[PDB]
Paper text:
Ferredoxins are small iron–sulfur proteins and key players in essential metabolic pathways. For catalysis, CYPs required electrons typically supplied by redox proteins, such as ferredoxins. Interestingly, two Mtb 3Fe–4S ferredoxins, Fdx and FdxE, are co-located in respective operons with cytochrome P450 (CYP) enzymes suggesting their functional relevance. Here, we explored the genome context for two ferredoxins, Fdx and FdxE, determined the binding kinetics between FdxE and CYP143, and solved three crystal structures: Fdx, CYP143, and a complex FdxE–CYP143.
We constructed a single protein containing FdxE fused via a linker to the N-term of CYP143. This protein was used to obtain a crystal structure of the FdxE−CYP143 complex at 1.6 Å resolution as well as for SAXS studies in solution. In the structure, FdxE binds to the proximal surface of CYP143 and has a typical fold of monocluster ferredoxins for Fdx. The buried area upon the complex formation between FdxE and CYP is 1,809 Å2. The shortest distance between the CYP143 heme group and the ferredoxin iron–sulfur cluster is 16.75 Å. As expected, several structural regions from the CYP143 proximal side participate in a complex formation, namely, helices C, K, and L and the meander preceding the heme-containing loop. The electron density of the iron–sulfur cluster of FdxE clearly identifies a [3Fe–4S] cluster coordinated by Fe—S bonds to cysteines Cys10, Cys16, and Cys54. A residue His13 of the CXXHXXC(X)nCP motif is not ligated to the [3Fe–4S] cluster. Instead, the N1 atom of the imidazole ring of His13 forms a hydrogen bond with the O∑1 atom of Glu56 from the opposite loop around the cluster. The inner salt bridge in the meander, between residues Asp326 and His330, maintains its specific conformation so that Lys328 forms a salt bridge with Asp49 of FdxE.
Numbering used by the authors: -5 to 74, 1009 to 1075, 1077 to 1393
């Protein structure tokens, strides 16, 4: 018994991509810099800190924190294809509409690699996590730019270009940076909840979730608040047309009007820079060009808003069904954060990441030729059952869980800190003013499937 070995924890710097989940477990044990990346220095773990240290190590989706036995001494020194049968499924008949767990289980069980409708889906954690970390082989640039001259900054870039974009942009998107915005975001969120509360009922998607992200976006980036509904309209049309081989005249015009609006905004920020993000990325040691900030602005609008909308809906749905959970969470920011992580783990708004391979690669004993289109199944991995943080159930055990709902590897969601901030604000201020509410009768929650959204079609709520 009494040979109790002590432990040390260290950071593998090549694995950290700044998820900052470790910091959420304990900010003093797991410090981060102004870009949201761990600055933990290797050290002996105090016996009283062992459980929180294990929790932080368990929270990192890149496995970048390593706990090892502190056992160095004078003797023990520490040095400083086989598969030819391709499974095929039809995407559109996966059982997704009612229960994502049943849907991803159907896909997972067909095999490590499943061909559906032109794409190779990688369904298994080993392959997905490895592929996310291997941008040389699994390229984002080859997959994620429409043949559109406006660069999709930073989504459609590989290292080293991608690395520069992340170095430049992460200081503006970190927990430290966004904390300065929180009084503003909280004030606007309180106002939105107050508009809802006095009604006694809503259809939460159309009435709140569809509006809340763009409202806060305008506040964050200093855009005119009266432009919200025009901008939502443009966003909705440009999202809808991305799937269309032959966009309508209304589609083309919507895209043109959004481009013209953002072009004028970006040019004005370059002429008269203020203490805002879109101004400041355009000056300093390594400036972004106007076209780069324009591409970034389009990406934030088209990818950072409907994702939060969808997560709002799932958050309110689950609270509506669970009265005792509502009561625990109210005025409980630490457990609200636990809850929001479970919602993103179980109902990630972008459940797969597309890539194109640059060289042959063997996955599941199967070799995929160079140039293969590949979808990495984050959502399925989040539910693969391989540990207690990976079930199909909502798990409220007081701990921050690792998951891949915000992606992983270098493209890990740039807005992940913001998404968590907005979702925890919403849940907290909803429960503050609307502690008890229920689903309207005869409601069955479903997503629209197959489609470009994994969000609830609607969410009818009622209260007194
Ligand atoms: C719950 C809400 C959100 C979820 C589930 C989500 C999910 C994701 C995922 C999985 C990726 C990686 C895609 C890939 O590897 O190809 C990603 C990338 C990205 N997301 Fe988020 N997102 C959310 C909210 C936001 C917000 C609020 C913003 C900013 C306003 C945003 C901006 C971005 C950007 C700029 C990237 C590209 C990062 C890069 O390629 O380096 N997202 N998102
Ligand atoms: S910030 Fe922390 S959660 Fe992981 S990716 Fe870096 S050690
Ligand atoms: Ni002993
Ligand atoms: Ni002894
Ligand atoms: Ni001792
Ligand atoms: Ni040990
Ligand atoms: Ni050792
Ligand atoms: Ni030993």
């Amino acid at each position: 018994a009494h040979h109790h070995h002590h432990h040390k924890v260290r950071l593998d710097p090549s694995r950290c991509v700044g998820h900052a989940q470790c910091y959420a477990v304990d900010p003093d044990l797991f410090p981060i810099d102004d870009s949201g990346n761990s600055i933990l220095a290797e050290h002996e773990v105090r016996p009283e800190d062992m459980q929180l240290t294990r929790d932080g190590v368990a929270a990192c989706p890149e496995m970048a924190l390593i706990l090892e036995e502190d056992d160095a001494d004078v003797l023990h020194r520490h040095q400083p294809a086989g598969s030819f049968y391709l499974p095929r499924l039809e995407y559109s008949t996966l059982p997704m509409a009612v229960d994502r767990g049943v849907g991803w289980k159907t896909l997972r069980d067909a095999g490590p690699v499943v061909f559906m409708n032109g794409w190779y889906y990688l369904t298994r954690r080993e392959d997905v996590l490895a592929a996310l970390r291997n941008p040389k082989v699994f390229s984002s640039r080859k997959a994620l730019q429409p043949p559109n001259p406006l660069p999709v900054v930073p989504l459609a870039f590989d290292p080293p270009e991608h690395t520069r974009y992340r170095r430049i942009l992460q200081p503006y998107f970190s927990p430290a940076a966004l904390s300065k915005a929180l009084p503003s975001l909280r004030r606007h969120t309180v106002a939105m909840i107050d508009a809802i509360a006095g009604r006694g009922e809503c259809e939460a998607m159309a009435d709140l979730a569809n509006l809340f992200p763009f409202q806060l976006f305008l506040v964050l980036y200093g855009l005119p608040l009266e432009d919200r509904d025009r901008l939502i309209g443009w966003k909705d049309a440009v999202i809808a047309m991305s799937d269309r081989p032959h966009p309508t005249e209304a589609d083309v015009a919507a895209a043109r009007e959004l481009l013209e609006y953002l072009t004028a905004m970006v040019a004005e920020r370059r002429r008269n820079p203020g203490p805002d993000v879109l101004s400041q990325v355009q000056i300093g040691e390594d400036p972004l060009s106007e076209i780069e900030v324009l591409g970034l602005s389009h990406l934030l609008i088209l990818a950072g808003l409907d994702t939060v909308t969808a997560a709002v809906g799932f958050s309110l749905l689950e609270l509506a069904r669970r009265p005792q959970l509502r009561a625990m969470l109210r005025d409980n920011p630490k457990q609200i954060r636990v809850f929001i992580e479970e919602i993103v783990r179980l109902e990630p708004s972008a459940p797969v990441a597309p890539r194109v391979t640059t060289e042959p690669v063997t996955v599941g004993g199967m070799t995929l030729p160079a140039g293969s289109p590949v979808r990495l199944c984050m959502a399925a991995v989040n539910r693969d059952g391989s540990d207690a943080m990976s079930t199909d159930e909502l798990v409220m055990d007081g701990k921050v869980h690792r998951h891949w709902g915000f992606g992983g590897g270098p493209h890990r969601c740039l807005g992940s800190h913001l998404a968590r901030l907005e979702l925890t604000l919403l849940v907290g201020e909803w429960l503050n003013q609307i502690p008890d509410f229920e689903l309207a009768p005869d409601y069955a929650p479903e997503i629209r499937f197959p489609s470009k959204s994994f969000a609830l079609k609607n969410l009818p709520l009622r209260w007194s």
